[PDB]
């Protein structure tokens, strides 16, 4: 940001110093300030450390006994 800020500072200054009919508003500084803030935001956003993903392991599966209806109960004699 020091390098980036210095570059924009020169841009703002050369406008401030030499502009024949500069409006006392700082618009060039404001827009330059916006760019460096955008430069900072993306730069600080970067994370050198690796971010681990959720682990997805395939666990062993073994079936379990499940109680089920017997159709023999249906059949009956009158």
């Amino acid at each position: 940001i020091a390098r980036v800020l210095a570059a924009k500072a020169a841009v703002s200054l050369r406008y401030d110093a030499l502009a024949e009919d500069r409006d006392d508003s700082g618009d060039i500084g404001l827009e330059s300030r916006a760019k460096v803030e955008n430069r900072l935001s993306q730069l600080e956003g970067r994370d050198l450390r690796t971010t681990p993903k959720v682990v997805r392991e395939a666990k062993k599966v073994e079936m379990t006994e499940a109680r089920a209806y017997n159709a023999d109960a249906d059949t009956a004699k009158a």
């Binding site: 600080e44 956003g45 970067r46 994370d47 450390r49 971010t51 681990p52 993903k53 959720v54 682990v55």
Partner: protein
């Protein structure tokens, strides 16, 4: 599995058993107000005393909090331990905790919530058991000083593994990692339930929606290149918007509108989905601001359509709904403003829709055509249908005038349509 692996599972299950002094130090040391040493120095009742006052301030701000005084923040709750209860008792305890987190979601900026939640952490250990619920409430506060503390005292579930780096870290979670957690398909399913609960309960607030839509949009941008996963994002994310549109809150409706627009541009989709989309968009459209946002959206959803019927007339029921919620004078005002977005094919579908169903509205079509330059095919098709009207409908001063407008502009194409049709 090795003995340690099964043993490790036992350790997780009985994390809150409060077995010995050494474990109890860790459980009690966790805090949201005080540091570890002071936290171990405090007792339950002192914590309850502060929280009870904290709830009262919240009750003044918002009445619904007063209910929890009867069940969670009661004086007799001090003696209630979760480890001793049965499953039937636990779920009822969990459900009450679930509701409290939802209301506390919008007041995290207020100090009293942080004190009030301390009792839940200390008494019921929400941080270890209701770990997912607590985070889902506080995701949008990711940069807030409260959120980093949440990470320090808590064990991340499997789905929140992306945040493991920033636990007990000077820097807060950055903007990018929020996207990474959201890119995971399973988390969207988990959050899908969470936002679903808020919509049912009318607990949603602007910081959530705007945080959601703005995270949800970024998932599209990251995943734009690969079509197949975008296809997997359709059965889930579109379902989100339909629920948001169902919410009476205008806030949710526009939140859905931001979602629909980006999907269509990112991923072209059937006209059937688009026609269904506007119909749901229009079904619960009451607020003025949503009305402005919707009309912009509806144009965009057609802007993405690039198949036969791109400019075909809206269905009869579809046509009726649009005019009721958007008078013709409204769209004229829409067509007047100079910074209007491209809506040439939507209006073209509309002009034909008027042509088929309304005889009175023809003279507005003239004004509609003047306001917006229609592309020459859109002109050709409009010419095509109007030829049928003359043969079927009685000749009218407006009807011939609509022809005369086409006589003035691009005379040759008018003959071409006549040559092909009659």
């Amino acid at each position: 599995s090795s003995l340690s692996d099964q043993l490790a599972q036992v350790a997780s299950n009985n994390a809150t058993v409060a077995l010995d002094r050494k474990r109890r130090q860790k459980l009690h040391s966790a805090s949201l107000i005080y540091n570890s040493k002071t936290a171990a120095t405090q007792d339950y009742d002192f914590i309850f005393e502060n929280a009870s006052k904290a709830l009262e301030e919240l009750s003044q701000i918002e009445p619904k909090f007063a209910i929890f005084s009867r069940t969670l923040f009661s004086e007799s709750s001090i003696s209630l331990d979760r480890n001793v209860q049965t499953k039937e008792e636990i779920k009822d305890l969990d459900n009450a905790i679930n509701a409290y987190l939802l209301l506390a979601s919008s007041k995290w900026y207020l100090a009293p919530t942080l004190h009030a939640t301390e009792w839940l952490v200390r008494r019921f250990q929400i941080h270890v058991k209701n770990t997912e619920m607590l985070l889902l409430s506080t995701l949008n506060y990711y940069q807030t000083p409260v959120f980093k503390r949440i990470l320090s005292i808590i064990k991340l579930p499997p789905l929140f593994n992306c945040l493991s780096n920033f636990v007990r870290s000077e820097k807060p979670p950055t903007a990018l990692t929020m996207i990474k957690l959201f890119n995971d398909m399973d988390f969207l399913k988990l959050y899908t339930s969470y936002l679903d609960q808020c919509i049912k309960h009318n607990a949603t607030y602007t910081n959530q929606l705007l945080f959601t839509t703005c995270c949800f949009i970024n998932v599209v941008a990251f995943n734009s290149n690969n079509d197949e996963k975008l296809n997997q994002l359709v059965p889930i994310l579109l379902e989100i918007s339909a629920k948001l549109l169902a919410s009476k809150s205008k806030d949710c409706q526009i939140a859905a509108h931001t979602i629909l627009v980006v999907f269509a541009t990112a991923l072209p989709l059937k006209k059937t989905i688009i026609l269904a989309a506007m119909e749901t968009i229009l079904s619960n459209l009451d607020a003025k601001e949503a009305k402005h946002s919707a009309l912009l959206t509806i144009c965009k959803l057609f802007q993405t359509l690039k198949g036969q019927g791109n400019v075909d007339q809206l269905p009869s029921k579809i046509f009726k709904l649009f005019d009721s919620k958007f008078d013709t004078v409204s769209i004229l005002t829409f067509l007047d403003k100079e910074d209007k977005p491209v809506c040439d094919k939507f209006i073209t579908s509309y002009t034909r829709s008027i042509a088929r169903y309304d005889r009175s509205k023809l003279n507005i079509i003239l004004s509609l055509l003047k306001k917006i330059r229609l592309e020459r095919y859109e002109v050709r098709l409009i010419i095509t249908d109007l030829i049928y009207l003359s043969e079927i409908l009685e000749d009218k001063s407006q009807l011939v005038e609509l022809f005369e407008y086409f006589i003035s502009i691009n005379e040759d194409l008018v003959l071409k349509c006549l040559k092909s049709l009659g």
